[PDB]
Curated annotation (Swiss-Prot):
Biological processes annotated in GO: base-excision repair; double-strand break repair; double-strand break repair via nonhomologous end joining; hippocampus development; negative regulation of protection from non-homologous end joining at telomere; negative regulation of protein ADP-ribosylation; regulation of base-excision repair; response to hydroperoxide
Superkingdom per UniProt: Eukaryota
Record note on modification: Phosphorylation by CK2 promotes interaction with APTX and APLF.
Disease: Spinocerebellar ataxia, autosomal recessive, 26: A form of spinocerebellar ataxia, a clinically and genetically heterogeneous group of cerebellar disorders due to degeneration of the cerebellum with variable involvement of the brainstem and spinal cord. SCAR26 is a progressive disease characterized by gait and limb ataxia, loss of independent ambulation, oculomotor apraxia, and peripheral neuropathy with distal muscle weakness and areflexia.
This protein's encoding gene: XRCC1
Originating species: Homo sapiens
Keywords: Chromosome, DNA damage, DNA repair, Isopeptide bond, Neurodegeneration, Nucleus, Phosphoprotein, Repeat, Ubl conjugation
Record-given protein name: DNA repair protein XRCC1
Function of the molecule: Scaffold protein involved in DNA single-strand break repair by mediating the assembly of DNA break repair protein complexes. Negatively regulates ADP-ribosyltransferase activity of PARP1 during base-excision repair in order to prevent excessive PARP1 activity. Recognizes and binds poly-ADP-ribose chains: specifically binds auto-poly-ADP-ribosylated PARP1, limiting its activity.
């Protein structure tokens, strides 16, 4: 099919035990991504792609988040987490105020071809780096409701 699904969280830089970033593998179940701790200032989570393919459109739901960046890369080599290419810079969906109880505390957004670099999006990748950014928590953890990709 002309879609892209996740397999497992290859790399991660912000995930808890029960609500770990691996919960993103089950976008339709009963668990989402939640930073390993509270004080959601900036969390990173690199997920793997069940198959190396290109990227034409992406889907990510914000769970009290505000900025969401996504990088692309392949499992080739795998020396450091800096051998990726900025597929789509951080996307601002919410703010650090409505995430509490002033406005939409949760919203889901997506990306297409215009939001992805053509020089890289058309390159077959099989790894993705998702990094959320925005200081909205302090005692309770949070992050994304789910993450998806589609060619």
């Amino acid at each position: 099919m002309p879609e892209i699904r996740l397999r497992h969280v290859v790399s991660c830089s912000s995930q808890d035990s029960t609500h770990c970033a691996e919960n993103l593998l089950k976008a339709d179940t009963y668990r989402k991504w939640r930073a390993a701790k509270a004080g959601e200032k900036t969390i990173s989570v690199v997920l793997q792609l069940e198959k190396e393919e290109q990227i034409h459109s992406v889907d990510i739901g914000n769970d009290g988040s505000a900025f969401v960046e996504v990088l692309v890369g392949s499992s080739a080599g795998g020396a450091g987490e800096q051998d990726y290419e900025v597929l789509l810079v951080t996307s601002s969906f919410m703010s650090p105020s409505e995430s509490r109880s002033g406005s939409n505390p949760n919203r889901v957004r997506m990306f297409g071809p215009d939001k992805l670099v053509r020089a890289a999006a058309e390159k077959r990748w099989d790894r993705v780096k998702i990094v959320c950014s925005q200081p909205y928590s302090k005692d309770s953890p949070f992050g994304l409701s789910f993450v998806r990709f589609h060619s």
